[PDB]
Amino acid sequence: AENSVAYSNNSIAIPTNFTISVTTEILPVSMTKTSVDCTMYICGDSTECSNLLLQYGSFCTQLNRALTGIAVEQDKNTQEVFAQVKQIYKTPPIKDFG
Amino acid sequence: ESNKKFLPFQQFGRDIADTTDAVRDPQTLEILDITPCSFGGVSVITPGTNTSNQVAVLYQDVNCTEVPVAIHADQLTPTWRVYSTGSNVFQTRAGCLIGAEHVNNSYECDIPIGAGICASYQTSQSIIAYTMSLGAENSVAYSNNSIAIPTNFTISVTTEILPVSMTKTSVDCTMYICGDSTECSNLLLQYGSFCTQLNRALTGIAVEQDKNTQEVFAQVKQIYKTPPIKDFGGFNFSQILPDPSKPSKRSFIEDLLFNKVTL
Amino acid sequence: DLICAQKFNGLTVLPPLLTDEMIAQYTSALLAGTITSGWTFGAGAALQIPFAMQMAYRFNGIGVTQNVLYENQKLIANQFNSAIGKIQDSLSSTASAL
Amino acid sequence: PFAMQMAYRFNGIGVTQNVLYENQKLIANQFNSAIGKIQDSLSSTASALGKLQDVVNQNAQALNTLVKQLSSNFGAISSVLNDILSRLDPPEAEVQIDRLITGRLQSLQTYVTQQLIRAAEIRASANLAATKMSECVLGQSKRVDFCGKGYHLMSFPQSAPHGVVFLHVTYVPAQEKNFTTAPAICHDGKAHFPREGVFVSNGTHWFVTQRNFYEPQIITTDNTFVSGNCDVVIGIVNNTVYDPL
Amino acid sequence: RLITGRLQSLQTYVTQQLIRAAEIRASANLAATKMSECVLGQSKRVDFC
Ligand SMILES: *[C@@H]1O[C@H](CO)[C@@H](O[C@@H]2O[C@H](CO)[C@@H](O)[C@H](O)[C@H]2NC(C)=O)[C@H](O)[C@H]1NC(C)=O
Numbered sequence: 001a002e003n004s005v006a007y008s009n010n011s012i013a014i015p016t017n018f019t020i021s022v023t024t025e026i027l028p029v030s031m032t033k034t035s036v037d038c039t040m041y042i043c044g045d046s047t048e049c050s051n052l053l054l055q056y057g058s059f060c061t062q063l064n065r066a067l068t069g070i071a072v073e074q075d076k077n078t079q080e081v082f083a084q085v086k087q088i089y090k091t092p093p094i095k096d097f098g
Numbered sequence: 099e100s101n102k103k104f105l106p107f108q109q110f111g112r113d114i115a116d117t118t119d120a121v122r123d124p125q126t127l128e129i130l131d132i133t134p135c136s137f138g139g140v141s142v143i144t145p146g147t148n149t150s151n152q153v154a155v156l157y158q159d160v161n162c163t164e165v166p167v168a169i170h171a172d173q174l175t176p177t178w179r180v181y182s183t184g185s186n187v188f189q190t191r192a193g194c195l196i197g198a199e200h201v202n203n204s205y206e207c208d209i210p211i212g213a214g215i216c217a218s219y220q221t222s223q224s225i226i227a228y229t230m231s232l233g234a235e236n237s238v239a240y241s242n243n244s245i246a247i248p249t250n251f252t253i254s255v256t257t258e259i260l261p262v263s264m265t266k267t268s269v270d271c272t273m274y275i276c277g278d279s280t281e282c283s284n285l286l287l288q289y290g291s292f293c294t295q296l297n298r299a300l301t302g303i304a305v306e307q308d309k310n311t312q313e314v315f316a317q318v319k320q321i322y323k324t325p326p327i328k329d330f331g332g333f334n335f336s337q338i339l340p341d342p343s344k345p346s347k348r349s350f351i352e353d354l355l356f357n358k359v360t361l
Numbered sequence: 362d363l364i365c366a367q368k369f370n371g372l373t374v375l376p377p378l379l380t381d382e383m384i385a386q387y388t389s390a391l392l393a394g395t396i397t398s399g400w401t402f403g404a405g406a407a408l409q410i411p412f413a414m415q416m417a418y419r420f421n422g423i424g425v426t427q428n429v430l431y432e433n434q435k436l437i438a439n440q441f442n443s444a445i446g447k448i449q450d451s452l453s454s455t456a457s458a459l
Numbered sequence: 460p461f462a463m464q465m466a467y468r469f470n471g472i473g474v475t476q477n478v479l480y481e482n483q484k485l486i487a488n489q490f491n492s493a494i495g496k497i498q499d500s501l502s503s504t505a506s507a508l509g510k511l512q513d514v515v516n517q518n519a520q521a522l523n524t525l526v527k528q529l530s531s532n533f534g535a536i537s538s539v540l541n542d543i544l545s546r547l548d549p550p551e552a553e554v555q556i557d558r559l560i561t562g563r564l565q566s567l568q569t570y571v572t573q574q575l576i577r578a579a580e581i582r583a584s585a586n587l588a589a590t591k592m593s594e595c596v597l598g599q600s601k602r603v604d605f606c607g608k609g610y611h612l613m614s615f616p617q618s619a620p621h622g623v624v625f626l627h628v629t630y631v632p633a634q635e636k637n638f639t640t641a642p643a644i645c646h647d648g649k650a651h652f653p654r655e656g657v658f659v660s661n662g663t664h665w666f667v668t669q670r671n672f673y674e675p676q677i678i679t680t681d682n683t684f685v686s687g688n689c690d691v692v693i694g695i696v697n698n699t700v701y702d703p704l
Numbered sequence: 705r706l707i708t709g710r711l712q713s714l715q716t717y718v719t720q721q722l723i724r725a726a727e728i729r730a731s732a733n734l735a736a737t738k739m740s741e742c743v744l745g746q747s748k749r750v751d752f753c
Pocket residue numbers: 017018436439440
């Protein structure tokens with residue numbers, strides 16, 4: 001919507017009331033922790049396939065190391081947001097807060 | 099054995115990935131399911147091997163009475179078969195844990211198992227498993243006309259460590275792939291510009307590392323010196339100020355830091 | 362004998378380390394600390410203060426004098442209670458905010 | 460002067476500056492002891508530079524994985540390229556060499572892709588360290604838990620291998636005491652509010668004090684202000700506001 | 705041929721998970737700053753809370 005401000009060299013506007021407002025903000029903290037058995041996906045239960053997969057080196061050791069680093073990172077994401085104070089305070093029985 | 103309800107026409111079944119996971123006997127006309135047999139989902143909990151040789155084993159998503167069935171323990175060596183049953187068998191929501199003594203206390207977490215459970219090597223020594231502790235319980239003496247005011251104070255000094263740069267590396271593609279062979283290097287010309295691309299990606303990382311150091315450390319352009327008389331009201335800065343009795347500009351704290359990182 | 366770590370060609374889902382009941386214990390300790398102590402528990406030990414006096418020093422921090430809070434205390438408390446009910450009214454409708 | 464600079468930093472956290480000048484030897488002694496306990500933790504057998512060593516360990520591990528992939532044949536007759544050219548002539552040697560080229564390009568492309576992802580994480584870490592050098596070393600910060608735990612006074616940088624250490628100096632409130640308090644004071648049918656502080660009571664007498672350090676004073680018309688009358692404030696208390704003149 | 709194609713599908717999954725995990729990590733760092741500066745204090749930064 002368009003608007004115009006009544007600017008001049010000796011005019012001011014002062015509020016006479018106020019409003020208390022409550023709004024909401026949502027943030028993602030973690031995601032799903034998955035793991036893949038790399039030999040069961042490629043060659044599942046076959047031993048002719050398992051010996052031909054040894055000729056490609058350390059590809060399944062390297063993919064499992066990358067996915068394990070993602071899964072450990074997710075539990076660290078939750079600890080930095082939620083475990084900020086180390087006392088577990090409980091709220092009093094009589095709720096007189098003015 | 100199966101409870102799949104086929105139709106009078108069908109011979110076998112398929113899952114999401116189009117693998118055969120059920121079948122019909124062509125003689126007795128019965129339906130029987132197929133299931134893999136490896137069981138890779140085994141995790142091994144250890145302290146150091148410079149601490150002990152005891153371990154505990156976690157079988158993932160498995161109920162504790164199906165462990166000798168799932169890992170096919172009768173065809174294993176007797177040194178594996180002690181980790182399929184016994185007295186130290188405990189069921190978590192992460193699976194079945196065998197080889198650890200479940201206690202009733204709660205401690206701060208040592209080795210995470212999952213879903214609230216941790217493990218420690220704790221007093222003869224053994225491996226114990228417990229529900230973890232969130233912290234010390236507290237209660238505030240709230241009233242509608244009471245206040246707490248502090249009467250003293252503490253001066254506190256803490257430490258924060260941050261990584262700034264990493265190692266600048268360089269790769270010659272042709273010597274890695276086709277090491278001083280000209281039969282190999284003429285064949286590599288038919289893959290296009292895969293190695294002009296890989297060389298300029300690593301060169302942009304190496305330029306970025308020197309820019310990372312400038313933005314942190316070269317924020318002022320006057321080299322200030324501190325005066326020879328150290329009259330700072332009783333405050334003593336001698337361990338963080340440079341020690342001129344060395345070839346370096348380094349302080350005492352900076353010297354303890356450069357000997358604790360193993361390059 | 363349903364071993365569902367075998368039924369999905371090597372793909373699994375790992376559980377989080379903190380349960381949903383432990384995260385709810387952390388957010389309730391953070392909330393009992395702010396209501397009874399203000400901002401003191403995040404910098405040291407928790408010092409109690411009455412809640413209307415704590416809301417008076419927050420009015421000071423945005424540049425309003427503290428008599429404006431004490432002279433308008435029931436109006437401000439009623440405006441807060443209505444804005445909390447609007448959050449809850451729009452979350453229990455079929456509009457999906459997450 | 461350095462004590463006059465430490466005094467305007469106490470004002471920045473809400474303590475009056477006479478609290479520093481009356482306690483100057485005690486504050487300097489607590490600082491000197493806390494610096495000496497940093498050095499005892501780094502002279503120890505406790506290696507707290509784990510975040511810096513993890514960066515060194517991850518890059519050496521990636522370079523060792525790339526050298527060990529040169530011993531794979533990827534379905535050829537050999538992983539050595541001079542063994543193929545010794546035993547075969549260029550028509551059927553070209554079938555075996557193209558298998559080794561394909562596996563070695565794929566190993567280099569995996570190395571470079573994960574170096575790019577790791578370099579983006581180092582870039583975000585050095586951006587955060589450039590903000591702490593400006594806001595904690597070159598100023599005093601009000602952002603909670605950005606320059607330590609407590610109320611921030613000052614920070615000092617030290618140089619580390621591939622990194623930086625910050626030494627944050629903070630003010631932590633100590634030994635506390637219970638009091639009775641009130642929001643206002645009613646004197647001549649008028650309400651009085653404190654200018655900077657709280658009204659507290661030791662049991663019989665009423666004072667006004669600052670909020671983060673206990674220092675009680677007589678309630679006068681120079682540390683209070685008047686607004687409205689007494690029928691409005693919930694919890695107002697009858698007392699005297701002494702006129703100083 | 706089946707090994708080469710299935711290895712390439714697994715590698716594409718893992719590379720895109722590393723890029724997704726880096727934006728979740730930047731998002732949780734922003735959430736940890738808001739718990740410190742908006743729940744444990746009062747903030748003067750415009751539109752941060
Ligand atoms: C400031 O605004 C509030 C509204 O937030 C006004 O209070 C309302 O007053 C009308 C008329 O008296 C009533 O119908 C409403 O029920 C009131 N709302 C509440 C929440 O009590 C208030 O009067 C305004 N102040 C001034 C001076 O105009």
